[PDB]
Write a protein that binds this DNA or RNA. Structure first.
Ligand code: K
Ligand code: K
Ligand code: K
Ligand code: K
Ligand code: MG
Ligand code: MG
Ligand code: MG
Ligand code: MG
Length: 114
RNA sequence: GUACACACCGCCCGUCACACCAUGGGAGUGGGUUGCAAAAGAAGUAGGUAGCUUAACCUUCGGGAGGGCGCUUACCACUUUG
């Protein structure tokens, strides 16, 4: 497994911040429109994390312009320019799929004080 | 006696056929308004308060009081369902 380990290690990002399910994060991703390249933000609740080395991913949910949207980011992709935690959430579960059935007041997540 | 008056060779009724018009019913179906039973909860105001932060007052100079932010509850507009 050392050959593939070396291949994966040379590609991993070194500056991924720590975040947990239930946190609010802002993800800045590259967008190409013609010749221009710019950063677009996507901010929402982390509802799932897949810890898998170079194949790590995380899922962010938001309500956007009257519509719920989920994005599954590949953590080490160069498309993802940056990740930052905006608010720390207090949940028990690793996977918050129950939030898909909730809106407004029913979907609130308590802040994690630490 | 009369409903006749170009005066019984008068007057006149209804179905049927034709034309037009408005209207009742009608499998139902589309709008408007509205009742009831719920869902919902922006902003504001009021109550509470883990957490964060404080120009005037009081300090035994460490702080205290009080305030603010944030969070939370109540009321409620949009909106949704039957
Ligand atoms: K007479
Ligand atoms: K006739
Ligand atoms: K008719
Ligand atoms: K307050
Ligand atoms: Mg005759
Ligand atoms: Mg009719
Ligand atoms: Mg209510
Ligand atoms: Mg409110």
């Amino acid at each position: 497994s050392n050959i593939i380990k070396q291949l994966e290690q040379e590609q991993m990002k070194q500056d991924v911040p720590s975040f947990r399910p239930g946190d609010t994060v802002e993800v800045k991703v590259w967008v190409v429109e013609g010749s221009k390249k710019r950063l677009q933000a996507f901010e929402g609740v982390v509802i799932a994390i897949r810890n898998r080395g170079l194949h790590s991913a995380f899922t962010v949910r938001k309500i956007s312009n009257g519509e719920g949207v989920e994005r599954v980011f590949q953590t080490h992709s160069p498309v993802v320019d940056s990740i930052s935690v905006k608010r720390r959430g207090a949940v028990r579960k690793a996977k918050l799929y129950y939030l898909r059935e909730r809106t407004g007041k029913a979907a609130r997540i308590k802040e994690r004080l630490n």
